[PDB]
Amino acid sequence: ALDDIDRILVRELAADGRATLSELATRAGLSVSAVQSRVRRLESRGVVQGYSARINPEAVGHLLSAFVAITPLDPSQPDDAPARLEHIEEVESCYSVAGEESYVLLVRVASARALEDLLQRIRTTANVRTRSTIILNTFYSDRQHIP
Amino acid sequence: ALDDIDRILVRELAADGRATLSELATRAGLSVSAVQSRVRRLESRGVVQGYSARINPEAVGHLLSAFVAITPLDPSQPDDAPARLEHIEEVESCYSVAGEESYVLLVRVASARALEDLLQRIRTTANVRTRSTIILNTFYSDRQHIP
Numbered sequence: 115a116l117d118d119i120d121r122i123l124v125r126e127l128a129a130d131g132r133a134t135l136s137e138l139a140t141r142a143g144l145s146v147s148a149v150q151s152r153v154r155r156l157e158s159r160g161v162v163q164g165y166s167a168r169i170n171p172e173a174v175g176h177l178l179s180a181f182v183a184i185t186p187l188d189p190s191q192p193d194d195a196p197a198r199l200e201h202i203e204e205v206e207s208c209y210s211v212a213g214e215e216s217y218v219l220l221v222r223v224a225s226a227r228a229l230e231d232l233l234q235r236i237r238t239t240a241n242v243r244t245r246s247t248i249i250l251n252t253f254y255s256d257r258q259h260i261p
Numbered sequence: 262a263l264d265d266i267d268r269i270l271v272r273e274l275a276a277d278g279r280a281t282l283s284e285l286a287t288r289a290g291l292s293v294s295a296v297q298s299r300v301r302r303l304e305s306r307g308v309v310q311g312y313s314a315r316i317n318p319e320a321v322g323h324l325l326s327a328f329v330a331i332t333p334l335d336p337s338q339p340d341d342a343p344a345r346l347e348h349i350e351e352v353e354s355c356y357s358v359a360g361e362e363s364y365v366l367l368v369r370v371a372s373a374r375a376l377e378d379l380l381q382r383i384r385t386t387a388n389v390r391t392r393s394t395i396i397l398n399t400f401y402s403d404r405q406h407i408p
């Protein structure tokens with residue numbers, strides 16, 4: 115569960131993360147008292163996990179984004195690739211997947227040449243083959259849907 | 262054009278999108294008014310595209326997430342898929358991509374049976390073939406990195 119007043123809160127907070135403790139409660143139909151603690155029981159139980167401004171990556175010098183699909187070389191060692199790559203900072207996301215490959219990483223980087231670098235790093239640090247797919251344009255990116 | 266100070270503001274706003282302007286100000290060493298101004302310029306050049314709560318998709322009922330790569334049934338028409346798929350709510354992101362396929366979507370849904378239904382709506386509304394890669398587990402996502 116997660117009641118149906120908690121939904122209007124999460125719908126509201128996903129389109130507007132600065133969305134103002136007061137303004138919420140009008141279209142939420144309630145008191146600033148009630149809201150501030152739903153919004154807090156919602157973070158306790160892990161339902162909203164954080165608040166983030168959406169930074170444009172081109173604008174901050176990330177001119178190439180790639181999905182990078184990786185598979186470990188040696189199935190005899192502990193498969194721990196996510197924890198091994200976790201310190202590499204250009205890896206923005208790391209998913210395990212049912213497909214040809216074990217994990218899919220989304221990765222951001224200064225230039226085509228910088229990707230060649232990040233990939234040699236990804237391979238020597240986890241012990242993986244890489245297969246990568248270059249993003250040409252992001253049309254829209256996390257529109258969260260609350261059913 | 263992004264100086265040392267704008268760098269500090271988008272990093273803080275990335276880690277905490279509900280950062281109050283006074284916490285931002287006493288962190289860049291400026292007045293709460295210089296901070297407001299800068300945050301507004303940041304928003305209207307295109308560096309900060311908005312603010313969102315990171316909602317946990319399992320908690321609101323999306324127990325299955327998938328990457329679906331889509332390629333045109335006839336590719337001579339200028340390309341359409343993103344616009345026509347914008348109105349499918351369960352499509353969370355849409356990137357065009359170099360290689361054999363044209364766009365990759367990240368999609369989220371209630372179940373196996375529901376994925377099967379979304380694939381139909383996708384094939385039909387964008388007139389596209391689809392290759393699905395089910396996500397088994399997300400280890401970390403959205404870690405935005407400001408260099």
Ligand SMILES: N[C@@H](Cc1c[nH]c[nH+]1)C(=O)O
Binds near residue numbers: 211218
């Ligand atoms: N083609 C990928 C799936 C994918 C996700 N994003 C891009 N591609 C795999 O090898 O598993």
Ligand SMILES: N[C@@H](Cc1c[nH]c[nH+]1)C(=O)O
Binds near residue numbers: 360
């Ligand atoms: N799929 C094409 C590029 C493309 C993007 N959208 C449609 N087509 C390629 O890899 O060369």
